[PDB]
Amino acid sequence: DMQNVITLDTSFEDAKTQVQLKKIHSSVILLYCSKDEAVLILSEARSLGL
Amino acid sequence: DMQNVITLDTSFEDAKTQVQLKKIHSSVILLYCSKDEAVLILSEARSLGL
Numbered sequence: 001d002m003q004n005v006i007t008l009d010t011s012f013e014d015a016k017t018q019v020q021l022k023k024i025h026s027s028v029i030l031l032y033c034s035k036d037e038a039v040l041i042l043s044e045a046r047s048l049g050l
Numbered sequence: 051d052m053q054n055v056i057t058l059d060t061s062f063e064d065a066k067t068q069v070q071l072k073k074i075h076s077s078v079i080l081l082y083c084s085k086d087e088a089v090l091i092l093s094e095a096r097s098l099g100l
Contacts, residue, residue, distance in 0.1 A: 019099035022072050047065040049072060 008033075012040060021048055062090060068098055075100070 006020035021044065029050065031038060056070045071079070079100070083091050 015097060015099045018068065022068075022099060025073060047068060049069055 008041075012037075012044065018044065018048065021045065021050065062094060067094070067100070071100065 003026055004024055006024060008017045008020065010016060029045075031041060033041060054074050056074050058067060058070060060066050081088055081091060
C-alpha cells in the first residue's frame with residue numbers, strides 16, 4: 001500500500017513542507033530531489049523526528 | 051479518557067515544539083505563556099505548521 005505522495009513545490013518555506021512531512025508517518029520514506037535541496041530536507045526531517 | 055500528554059518548556063530555539071507536535075497535537079494545544087511570550091510563541095507557530 002503506497003501512502004500519500006507529497007511534492008514540495010515551494011522552496012521549503014511557509015512551513016507547508018513541514019506540514020506535508022508531518023502528515024506522513026511511516027517507517028519507509030522515499031526522497032527524490034537535488035543534492036542541495038536534500039541537504040536541508042534531511043535537516044528538516046531531523047527537526048521533525050523522521 | 052486522557053490521551054498522551056507531552057509537556058514542553060524551553061526557549062524559542064533548538065527547533066523545539068515541532069519535534070513532539072507530530073502525532074500528539076491532533077486536537078487543541080494548551081499554551082501557558084504571558085502576553086509577550088504567548089505572542090512570540092504564536093508567531094513561531096504561525097511561521098510553523100501549527
